[PDB]
Structure formats: structure tokens, C-alpha cells
């Protein structure tokens, strides 16, 4: 009976979704002028790393970056001068995520150690120091983004997300509902609700205040690797191993676009939008990064400049540049 | 021209020097991905080193070994086994006193897209009590296709053949060994294997392999 109740609820949810799907973006974007051929070139190269780079994150000042690499060094870069203004030795070199605080005062990093490390930058003593260790996850840390200088939310490899109070280090609000382990995590511009992407091919929206899932989206065929909110917070795109990215809308509560092309047979590592939200930048396994016109799913250009897998991707808050790290141990900043 | 930011440039160069020194020190170490099933013998192996992920380390005969034991993590391995690409070798171990899960795992990882050219040091652990299990429990129940006697050495050889058959490429080698539940020599076996591996990598860098 209860299984039948669940099946009936799923069926009526699907029926309501079909009723709400009066059109698709493909037939409404028939009058939009495409972005054309995007020709981009590397403007900076950060070649201080010594092994694979898994994570990066720009700064809200749009000048300083943070990079996480297998070398065990979390080095803050000067994107204009190429100076390495800071260099943090990690307690564990198995790092796949990093975060730069919106104020720039703090920086977060984590990985297979199940711990999100919060490092204080504006230290009175002059050296970068760990402020507190975020522990409690039973799975590996996959992504983490700051709400402010005190609140951070961390994705994990145990199908759960957690929102942290850095002052106490406890789990202010824990998140459950994914059936597979979670790979990505991104925050809305209003910072009132976020989404997470898990290997169960499902991306779902959560409330930071109460932890209740607000809209669960499905449609992917394989594991979700990356998610980025649209600049308005009313949509987000997902990155998956199936060589396809898909766009989900919160109000429509259903998938809206799928970014596919037969020439790609490899998964997406990281995804992010531009400032206007027209460009969807996805890092791929085949050594290159494509640019996706989020309104038309067009492949407007290729950011092919890495000798190995491009893994991490971030875009300036000013919209000036995108930096794509890779396993080639070199970052690259583009325009 | 440059302002007093020359001091920032000097700090950047100092950071570069420190990073280069740290990397030169790090490349001196040998990275090993310890691996296997639950209770297969990874814990015993790191115990014999005499010292989420636990990166057990030890030094032996002028080499610095780091055992990256990733068996304490219950998660999909397809999302984090790539973190261990470009290690010196894999110390994958199995339990003879089990089994099909170990064979499936070895087929998945020995032929993984990241370890297709990475040597694997297969340790058939738990030899002493498997020597009693073979007498008490016929191996035919563990391997229905086993067309051979129930004597010990041939059963061990049959398990060796079943494990070694999983390789699909001619550019990788598998160093099978038996831990015999006493060890005190697996350090030497690992040392010989990683010596061959580092010599091969040196040859490849020099074009000799």
C-alpha cells in the first residue's frame, strides 16, 4: 500500500509537471540572437602548483583566488600580478574543494579527510592559520561555499549536506534526502536556499533555514558532478558524467534544457555561469572546457588549453574572467 | 614601472622557492595506494609498517613510503579513485580465508581507466590459516570451475591464476606474493617492486622504456 502510495504520488507529480510544461525553451528562443563564436585566450597562467588541481574559487574582490591541489598547498594567487600572496600547507593533500569567503577574510578547503578546514587570512601574526576544523561528515567532502564570515554549508560523499556555524563548528542544520553521495553545492544570490548535486542523477533544492527540500529534480542518466545557480537564483545547471549538462528551474520544478553533443563522450568536472548567465562554462574530462549558451545549448567555443583533465572552474564576481584549473598543475585565466 | 610592489614580487619569489624545495622533498617519497576488501589485511600491512583516508607512512632502505589506505571510506569509488592516479603502485591485498567480491574489485581496479599502466602488488594475505581452510573446506565451493586437486600449493596457484587473468593490457605487471600472516618481509617485496617501477619511470623519462 505505502509503496503504491509513493508510486501514485510520483505519478501525480509527473502529471502536474507535464501540465505545467506548456512549452520548452527551444521553441521560445527561436528569436534570440546567439552569442556567436566565442574566441577566448589565456590572459594569466599560475604555474606554481606541482600536481593535480581539483578545486579553485575566485574572490568577491575579483582579484584573489584559492587553489586546492594534490601537492598539499592551498595557495592564494594574485590574478593580476601572478604573485602567490599566500601559501598554506594542508594537513592532508587529498583536497577536492576550496572556498573563498565573501569578505576575503577566510578560506575553506577539504577533501577525503572528511573535514572542512577554515583558514584565517587576516591574521594579526601575519601567517595563515586554521581557525577551526569542521568535522561530522561520514563521507568525503566534495564542495563547500560560504554564506558569510560565520556560516558555511558543505557537501559530502555520504548523501548529506550540512550547514555550519564556524563560531561553534557545530551542524546548525543538517540536510538529508539524496540517495547517492553529493558532489557539488552552490548558493543562491539571495543566500536563502541552495541546491546540491549527487551521484543518484538527482539535483534538489534545500532551505537553509529549516533544511526542508523544496523541489527535487531528476532526468539525468548518470552521476551529477557540478551545479551552479543562475545569477538570479531561480534556475541552476547541473554537470554529470553522461557528457550532458541539464538546466533546472525552481518555479517550474522540472528540467528545462539539456546540454548534449555527440562529439563528447566524457563527463563534466565543474560548471559555472557568467555574470549575465548567458554562458554556461563546464569543465570536461577530455582536456578541454566548452562554453554553453544557457538559453540555446549552443557550443559557442572551446577553452582547450590544458594538457590534462580540466577539473575546477570559477568566474569573477565582476564578470571579468574565468579561471580553469586542471590536472596539468597549471591554472589559466581567460577573457 | 613597478612601485614598492617589488616587495610583493619578492614575497612571491620566496614562496616559489619554498614551494620548489617542498616539492623536491615530496618527490623523494614513494606513493602507494593500499587497497583491498574489508578485513583483507590492509590493517595488518600498515601495522607491519611499525608506526576517511589514513596515509600511513614509513621509511625503509633509504626510501620513504606512504601507504594511502582508502578502505575506511564507504562511498562510490568511481568518484575518488582518480585521486590516487599517478601513484607509484597499488598494494591491493585479498584474504585467502574468505572471495568473489575481492575478484570483482580486482577486475574493476586492475583494469580501471586510471590504473591501466600502474603496477599492482597483489598480496594474497592470510596464508597460514588458508592452509587449514583448504583441508577443512574444499576450494571447489569457492571456485566451481576449479578443475584441480585439493592439495595446498596447486590451490594457491589456481587462485593466483584466477587473479592474474584479469589483466587486459601488455604494458603492466602484477607482483603476486603471499603475506603468510607473519610478514617481516613484505617491506622487501614492496621495495623491489617500487624499485622496478621507479627505474621504469626513469627509463621512460629518459626514453629507455
Amino acid at each position: 500500500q505505502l509503496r503504491q502510495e509513493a508510486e501514485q504520488l510520483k505519478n501525480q507529480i509527473r502529471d502536474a509537471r507535464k501540465a505545467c510544461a506548456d512549452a520548452t525553451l527551444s521553441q521560445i528562443t527561436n528569436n534570440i540572437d546567439p552569442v556567436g563564436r566565442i574566441q577566448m585566450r589565456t590572459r594569466r597562467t599560475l604555474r606554481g602548483h606541482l600536481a593535480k588541481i581539483y578545486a579553485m574559487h575566485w574572490g568577491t574582490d575579483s582579484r584573489l583566488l584559492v587553489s586546492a591541489s594534490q601537492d598539499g598547498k592551498l595557495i592564494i594567487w594574485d590574478s593580476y600580478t601572478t604573485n602567490k600572496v599566500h601559501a598554506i600547507p594542508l594537513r592532508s593533500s587529498w583536497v577536492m574543494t576550496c572556498a573563498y569567503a565573501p569578505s576575503g577574510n577566510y578560506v575553506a578547503c577539504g577533501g577525503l579527510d572528511n573535514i572542512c578546514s577554515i583558514y584565517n587570512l587576516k591574521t594579526r601574526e601575519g601567517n595563515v592559520r586554521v581557525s577551526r576544523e569542521l568535522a561530522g561528515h561520514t563521507g568525503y567532502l566534495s564542495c563547500c561555499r560560504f554564506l558569510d564570515d560565520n556560516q558555511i554549508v558543505t557537501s559530502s560523499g555520504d548523501t548529506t549536506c550540512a550547514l555550519w556555524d564556524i563560531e561553534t563548528g557545530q551542524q546548525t542544520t543538517t540536510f538529508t534526502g539524496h540517495t547517492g553521495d553529493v558532489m557539488s553545492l552552490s548558493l543562491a544570490p539571495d543566500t536563502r536556499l541552495f541546491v546540491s548535486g549527487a551521484c543518484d542523477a538527482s539535483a534538489k533544492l534545500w532551505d537553509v533555514r529549516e533544511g526542508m527540500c523544496r523541489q527535487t529534480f531528476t532526468g539525468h542518466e548518470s552521476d551529477i558532478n557540478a551545479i551552479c545557480f543562475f545569477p538570479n537564483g531561480n534556475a541552476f545547471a547541473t554537470g554529470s558524467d553522461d557528457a550532458t549538462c541539464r538546466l533546472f528551474d525552481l518555479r517550474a520544478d522540472q528540467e528545462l534544457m539539456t546540454y548534449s553533443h555527440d562529439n563528447i563522450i566524457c563527463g563534466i568536472t565543474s560548471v559555472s555561469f557568467s555574470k549575465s548567465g548567458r554562458l554556461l562554462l563546464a569543465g570536461y574530462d577530455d582536456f578541454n572546457c566548452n562554453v554553453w549558451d544557457a538559453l540555446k545549448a549552443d557550443r559557442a567555443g572551446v577553452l582547450a588549453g590544458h594538457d590534462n583533465r580540466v577539473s575546477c572552474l570559477g568566474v569573477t564576481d565582476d564578470g571579468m574572467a574565468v579561471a580553469t584549473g586542471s590536472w596539468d598543475s597549471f591554472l589559466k585565466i581567460w577573457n | 614601472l613597478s612601485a614598492e610592489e617589488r616587495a610583493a614580487l619578492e614575497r612571491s619569489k620566496a614562496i616559489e622557492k619554498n614551494l620548489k624545495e617542498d616539492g623536491i622533498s615530496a618527490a623523494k617519497d614513494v606513493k602507494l595506494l593500499l587497497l583491498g576488501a574489508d578485513n583483507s589485511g590492509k590493517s595488518t600491512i600498515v601495522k607491519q609498517m611499525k608506526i576517511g583516508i589514513v596515509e600511513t607512512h614509513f621509511t625503509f632502505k633509504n626510501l620513504h613510503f606512504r601507504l594511502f589506505d582508502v578502505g575506511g571510506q564507504r562511498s562510490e569509488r568511481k568518484k575518488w579513485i582518480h585521486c590516487f592516479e599517478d601513484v607509484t603502485a597499488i598494494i591491493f591485498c585479498v584474504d585467502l580465508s574468505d572471495m568473489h567480491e575481492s575478484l570483482m574489485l580486482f577486475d574493476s581496479i586492475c583494469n580501471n581507466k586510471f590504473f591501466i599502466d600502474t603496477s599492482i602488488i597483489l598480496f594474497l594475505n592470510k596464508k597460514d590459516l588458508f592452509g587449514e581452510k583448504i583441508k577443512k573446506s574444499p576450494l571447489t565451493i569457492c571456485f566451481p570451475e576449479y578443475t584441480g586437486p585439493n592439495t595446498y600449493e596447486d590451490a594457491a596457484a589456481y587462485i593466483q591464476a584466477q587473479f592474474e587473468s584479469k589483466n587486459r593490457s601488455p604494458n603492466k605487471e602484477i607482483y603476486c606474493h603471499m603475506t603468510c600472516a607473519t610478514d617481516t618481509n613484505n617491506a622487501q617485496v614492496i621495495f623491489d617492486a617500487v624499485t622496478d617501477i621507479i627505474i621504469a619511470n626513469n627509463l621512460r623519462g629518459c626514453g629507455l622504456y
Epitope: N83, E125, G126 | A3, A8, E10
Partner: single-chain antibody, 230 residues
């Protein structure tokens, strides 16, 4: 907490020589490009020495070049400034100055207690007033001028503001003329451009009584000093 205590001062016969030590504690001295500056008993501050991180870059004053030498011993966390052939113009209280240089950093963010030493194309900073009367809760504007433009082509303007309380050590208020230094109340503020500068203070208290110096950091220089009193 950060501390800088110096030693090696006292009485020196004319023509003599001695070395001054800056014992550092409470911070990672190895990555700090410490300075050493002095103040005559009835004059403004003046630049003397500068040693970079790792002892890779060093400069001295024009009246001191080839006459003194600055040394850094990082493992012992001590800064050395050996002075040779002391003259009548070298008597002063010497302040060890802490500094670290990266983007968004606060140079000159800490100063030492000081040691008295007694004997028996340059950019010049000028202050139009030496002393003005102030009242608590009022608003004042303290200004100083520079001979050369402090605004670099990259947009940064290298002007710094310091306050000298009576019987105390100078403390940084504003670095790069706009960014208020850590540990200072928001009451202070800085503004200006090109060759003219000013410091805007509102809601003054007794803690603001002192002498205000301004320093330019564009090229290898303090002002005269403006005193506030009731």
C-alpha cells in the same frame, strides 16, 4: 600578541659606533620586512633603514647610506641595526617598525617601544599646521602635502597616517590613505588625491590627543607633525 622591544641605546661618545637590536615576539618575523626609524626629541620622524623578508633587499637613508648597516637574524627573531661613526645629528629615539608586503596588506602596522641614543628627487612631506585646538565630540580635518604625486598608475596612493600619543609609540591609523587599519575605531577616516591629502576625524575623545604624522611609501620620509590638544 605582537611585541617589539629594542635594546642597545644609551650614551655614546662622539665618533663612536654601536649596534641596536629589535627583539621580535608574538608573530612570524621571518615573513615580515621590518624597518627601523627614529625620532629626534624635538623633531618629526625620519626613515633610516629597511630590510626585506629573507634579507634579500635592503636600503638606507641618504644621510645614513654607507654609514650604518641593518641585519636580520630570523631564527632568533631579532633585527639588528649596526650604527657606525655616530654624529650630532643621529641622537634620537629609535623605533623598530614591522611591515609585511602583499596585496591588501598593512605595512607599518606595528611599532616598537623605542630606545634613546644620545651623543655629545627626494619626496618631502610638509604639514601646514603644527598644532590646533580640539574639543571632545567636535570634528577636525588634519592635512599634509607631498612634493610628488603619491597616486601610482595602478590606482593605489601610498600615503600612511600615524598618531603619536604623549609618552607612547606611534600606531597606524590609515594605510594607503583609504583603508583604516585593524584595531582602530571607525571614527577616523582618510581622503585626498594627487598631491593634497587630509585626515577627517569626527567625535573626538581624549584618546585622540597626540601628534599626527603622514608618510609616503611610493619610493625610497615623514611629515612635520600636527599636535591636537584642548
Amino acid at each position: 600578541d605582537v611585541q617589539l622591544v629594542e635594546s642597545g641605546g644609551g650614551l655614546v661618545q662622539p665618533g663612536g659606533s654601536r649596534k641596536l637590536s629589535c627583539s621580535a615576539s608574538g608573530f612570524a618575523f621571518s615573513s615580515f620586512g621590518m624597518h627601523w626609524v627614529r625620532q629626534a626629541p624635538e623633531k618629526g620622524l625620519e626613515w633610516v633603514a629597511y630590510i626585506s623578508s629573507g634579507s634579500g633587499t635592503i636600503y638606507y637613508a641618504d644621510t645614513v647610506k654607507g654609514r650604518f648597516t641593518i641585519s636580520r637574524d630570523d631564527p632568533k627573531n631579532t633585527l639588528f641595526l649596526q650604527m657606525t661613526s655616530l654624529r650630532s645629528e643621529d641622537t634620537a629615539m629609535y623605533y623598530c617598525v614591522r611591515s609585511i608586503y602583499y596585496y591588501g596588506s598593512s605595512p607599518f602596522d606595528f611599532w616598537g617601544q623605542g630606545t634613546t641614543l644620545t651623543v655629545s628627487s627626494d619626496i618631502v612631506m610638509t604639514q601646514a599646521t603644527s598644532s590646533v585646538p580640539v574639543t571632545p565630540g567636535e570634528s577636525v580635518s588634519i592635512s599634509c602635502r607631498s612634493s610628488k604625486s603619491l597616486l601610482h598608475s595602478n590606482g593605489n596612493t601610498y600615503l600612511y597616517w600615524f598618531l603619536q600619543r604623549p609618552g607612547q609609540s606611534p600606531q597606524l591609523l590609515i594605510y594607503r590613505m583609504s583603508n583604516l587599519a585593524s584595531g582602530v575605531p571607525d571614527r577616523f577616516s582618510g581622503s585626498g588625491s594627487g598631491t593634497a591629502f587630509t585626515l577627517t576625524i569626527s567625535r573626538l575623545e581624549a584618546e585622540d590627543v597626540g601628534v599626527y604624522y603622514c608618510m609616503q611609501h611610493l619610493e625610497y620620509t615623514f611629515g612635520a607633525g600636527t599636535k591636537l590638544e584642548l
